[PDB]
Design an enzyme around this catalytic site. Structure first.
Site, PDB file in Angstrom:
ATOM      1  N   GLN A  74       0.724  -1.143  -0.058  1.00 47.72           N
ATOM      2  CA  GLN A  74      -0.048  -0.007  -0.034  1.00 47.72           C
ATOM      3  C   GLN A  74       0.727   1.266   0.251  1.00 47.72           C
ATOM      4  O   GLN A  74       1.904   1.249   0.615  1.00 47.72           O
ATOM      5  CB  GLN A  74      -1.008   0.123   1.146  1.00 47.72           C
TER       6      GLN A  74
HETATM    7  N1  LIG Z   1      -7.035 -10.861 -12.499  1.00 45.67           N
HETATM    8  C1  LIG Z   1      -5.990 -11.262 -11.705  1.00 45.67           C
HETATM    9  N2  LIG Z   1      -5.980 -10.820 -10.313  1.00 45.67           N
HETATM   10  C2  LIG Z   1      -5.181 -11.213  -9.461  1.00 45.67           C
HETATM   11  C3  LIG Z   1      -4.141 -11.824 -10.055  1.00 45.67           C
HETATM   12  N3  LIG Z   1      -3.168 -12.013  -8.909  1.00 45.67           N
HETATM   13  C4  LIG Z   1      -3.588 -11.220  -7.680  1.00 45.67           C
HETATM   14  N4  LIG Z   1      -4.899 -10.812  -8.225  1.00 45.67           N
HETATM   15  C5  LIG Z   1      -5.789 -10.188  -7.457  1.00 45.67           C
HETATM   16  O1  LIG Z   1      -5.149  -8.793  -7.096  1.00 45.67           O
HETATM   17  C6  LIG Z   1      -5.758  -8.321  -5.598  1.00 45.67           C
HETATM   18  C7  LIG Z   1      -4.401  -8.181  -5.012  1.00 45.67           C
HETATM   19  O2  LIG Z   1      -3.734  -9.241  -4.783  1.00 45.67           O
HETATM   20  P1  LIG Z   1      -2.993  -9.429  -3.431  1.00 45.67           P
HETATM   21  O3  LIG Z   1      -1.922 -10.415  -3.681  1.00 45.67           O
HETATM   22  O4  LIG Z   1      -3.682  -9.493  -1.931  1.00 45.67           O
HETATM   23  O5  LIG Z   1      -2.370  -7.968  -3.404  1.00 45.67           O
HETATM   24  P2  LIG Z   1      -0.971  -7.863  -2.697  1.00 45.67           P
HETATM   25  O6  LIG Z   1       0.041  -7.525  -3.871  1.00 45.67           O
HETATM   26  O7  LIG Z   1      -0.619  -8.880  -1.514  1.00 45.67           O
HETATM   27  O8  LIG Z   1      -1.238  -6.132  -1.944  1.00 45.67           O
HETATM   28  P3  LIG Z   1      -1.313  -5.867  -0.316  1.00 45.67           P
HETATM   29  O9  LIG Z   1      -1.966  -7.090   0.093  1.00 45.67           O
HETATM   30  O10 LIG Z   1      -1.906  -4.623  -0.070  1.00 45.67           O
HETATM   31  O11 LIG Z   1       0.298  -5.650   0.083  1.00 45.67           O
HETATM   32  C8  LIG Z   1      -6.232  -9.747  -5.002  1.00 45.67           C
HETATM   33  O12 LIG Z   1      -7.708  -9.536  -4.931  1.00 45.67           O
HETATM   34  C9  LIG Z   1      -6.068 -11.082  -6.049  1.00 45.67           C
HETATM   35  O13 LIG Z   1      -6.790 -11.851  -6.041  1.00 45.67           O
HETATM   36  C10 LIG Z   1      -3.922 -12.507 -11.278  1.00 45.67           C
HETATM   37  O14 LIG Z   1      -2.945 -12.811 -11.757  1.00 45.67           O
HETATM   38  N5  LIG Z   1      -5.159 -11.672 -12.186  1.00 45.67           N
END
Ligand SMILES: Nc1nc2c(ncn2[C@@H]2O[C@H](COP(=O)(O)OP(=O)(O)OP(=O)(O)O)[C@@H](O)[C@H]2O)c(=O)[nH]1
Ligand SMILES: [Mg+2]
Lengths: 160, 349
Positions: free
Chosen positions: A54
């Site tokens: 974030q």
């Molecule tokens: N369409 C799509 N969505 C994805 C993909 N990978 C992750 N997401 C989605 O994007 C959103 C963010 O994923 P996270 O892994 O929680 O994001 P983060 O990178 O950990 O971000 P923070 O938790 O704030 O540190 C989630 O709802 C995932 O399901 C992907 O390959 N394709």
């Protein structure tokens, strides 16, 4: 091999963390602190460090640099409005004395999406193209499917 | 040879999933698991559950903030049994209790043997099992906190009037059935088009009269029917019942899942199957100090992640909060008093 996954929030880092840790995709939540988990792949026990991407809690990752051997930069290839906001975090990350010399996996994640940015454009739009003295490989992935991830491991493993 | 309370805890302890039971066994386990109920926990606890069986056995479980488990059983024959234990990986006694956990992702369950999602009735029954299972907290967010928005509770009395008759509903462990539920809807003044309750229901709760009928027509023990009656006769009762049906409590969880929700919704219309949107399941408890605690569940259909094509399951949204003693069923008051905790589960087959 201790690994540190960095990226902007909502890139899918945590998702990749458990796609790999559990083997099956889960529904992640805004990571507030951090996660860390271990993954044996091909007789190699990666030790991956997930830290909240974030806008807020960004400068706490430096607290993690000392030890890293590979900078998995994970990317949301649909969000083009922070494409720059992120082509920069990349440069700041590896510039900091901590990460002077380290192989660099780039997850062009979220490819399954419609406006999916192509892997090469990723290379381009990050600024990866005009850089040397440095191992930097681009890996198209879908974190929810598993695509690319275990091929990206191949690179971490192989190229180290 | 065992009281229902001892059986449940043993089953809960061994593994509520450990693939061995003879269906006749599972079926009779789900049965027992239905009377188990989340109640107000201490500030140093993840949560607390309580059950009263038709054999006079009773089961209470505490889970301390450090996932430490404390059980108390009282039998048919006035035996007092205290159990100490930790849920680990094999048991996961923790997964098998209606409590909120702090986790990086939404807890995934599996259903029992022959549970399906094929019709409205198989759905309420999946919720019947999911609503006793563990969930993952979704951290507060001004953007998704339905109480943060500009229309807080605007649909409260429509969801209430609508969900009443067509919910699983428990008051202090007593099952309120469909007619008693419609009776409670009338008792609030809510079969009405879209009026609010009587200024009487507010301030006075329900009447003794309506209360007695309601509990009379409801399932359980006499002593328990008496708690129902007395609970109904406060205004906080209305507050708690009405807020429990509030539809936007699901927003945070739907915020996380909406596309695989849409997929699940689309995925059914291609088939021509007609199962509903949400399935509602509510547990309200007033403990002897007169504290009121609400756990409200909405189950909604949802597709598995892309790595599991064509697999559908349920997303179980839990919302939990105390209704402090002094809060009557008006918007501005519930907006300021109630502090909903939001948590979700995903369950598959
Ligand atoms: N369409 C799509 N969505 C994805 C993909 N990978 C992750 N997401 C989605 O994007 C959103 C963010 O994923 P996270 O892994 O929680 O994001 P983060 O990178 O950990 O971000 P923070 O938790 O704030 O540190 C989630 O709802 C995932 O399901 C992907 O390959 N394709
Ligand atoms: Mg994260």
């Amino acid at each position: 091999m201790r690994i540190l996954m960095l990226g902007l929030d909502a890139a899918g880092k945590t998702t990749i963390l458990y796609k790999l840790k559990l083997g099956q995709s889960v529904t992640t939540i805004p990571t507030v602190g951090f996660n860390v988990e271990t993954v044996t792949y091909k007789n190699v026990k990666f030790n991956v460090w997930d830290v909240g991407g974030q806008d807020k809690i960004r400068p706490l990752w430096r607290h993690y640099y000392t030890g890293t051997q590979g900078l998995i930069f994970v990317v949301d290839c649909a969000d083009r409005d922070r494409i720059d906001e992120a082509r920069q975090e990349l440069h700041r990350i590896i510039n900091d004395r901590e990460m002077r010399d380290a192989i660099i996996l780039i997850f062009a994640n979220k490819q399954d999406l419609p406006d999916a940015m192509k892997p090469h454009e990723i290379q381009e739009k990050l600024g990866l193209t005009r850089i040397r003295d440095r191992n930097w490989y681009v890996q198209p992935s879908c974190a929810t499917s598993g695509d690319g991830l275990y091929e990206g491991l191949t690179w971490l493993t192989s190229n180290y | 040879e065992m009281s229902c309370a001892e059986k449940l805890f043993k089953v809960l302890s061994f593994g509520l999933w450990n693939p061995t039971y003879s269906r006749s066994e599972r079926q009779s386990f789900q049965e027992l698991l239905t009377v188990l109920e989340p109640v107000y926990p201490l500030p140093n606890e993840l949560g607390r559950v309580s059950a009263r069986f038709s054999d006079g056995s009773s089961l209470r479980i505490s889970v301390t903030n450090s996932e430490l488990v404390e059980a108390e059983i009282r039998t048919a024959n006035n035996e007092k049994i205290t159990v100490l234990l930790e849920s680990n990986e094999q048991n996961r006694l923790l997964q098998s209790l209606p409590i909120d956990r702090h986790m990086p992702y939404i807890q995934v369950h599996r259903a029992l043997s022959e549970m399906d999602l094929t019709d409205t009735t198989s759905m309420r029954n999946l919720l019947g099992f999911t609503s006793k299972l563990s969930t993952t907290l979704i951290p507060h967010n001004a953007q998704t906190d339905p109480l943060s928005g500009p229309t807080p509770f605007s649909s409260i009395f429509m969801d209430t009037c609508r969900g009443l008759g067509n919910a699983k509903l428990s008051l202090n462990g007593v099952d309120i059935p469909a007619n008693a539920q419609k009776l409670l809807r009338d008792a609030l003044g809510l079969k009405d088009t879209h009026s609010s309750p009587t200024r009487n229901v507010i301030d006075h709760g329900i009447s003794r009269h309506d209360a007695e009928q309601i509990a009379r027509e409801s399932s359980g023990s006499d002593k328990q029917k008496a708690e129902v009656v007395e609970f109904l006769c406060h205004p906080e009762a209305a507050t708690a019942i009405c807020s429990a049906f509030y539809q936007s409590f699901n927003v945070p969880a739907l915020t996380l899942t909406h596309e695989r929700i849409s997929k699940a919704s689309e995925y059914n219309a291609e088939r021509s199957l007609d199962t509903p949107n949400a399935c509602i399941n509510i547990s309200i408890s007033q403990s002897s100090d007169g504290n009121i605690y609400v756990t409200s569940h909405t189950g909604v259909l949802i597709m598995a992640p892309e790595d599991r094509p064509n697999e559908m399951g349920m997303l179980t949204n839990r919302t939990s909060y105390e209704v402090p003693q002094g809060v009557k069923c008006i918007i501005d008051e519930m907006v300021s008093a109630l502090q909903p905790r939001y948590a979700a589960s995903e369950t598959y087959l």
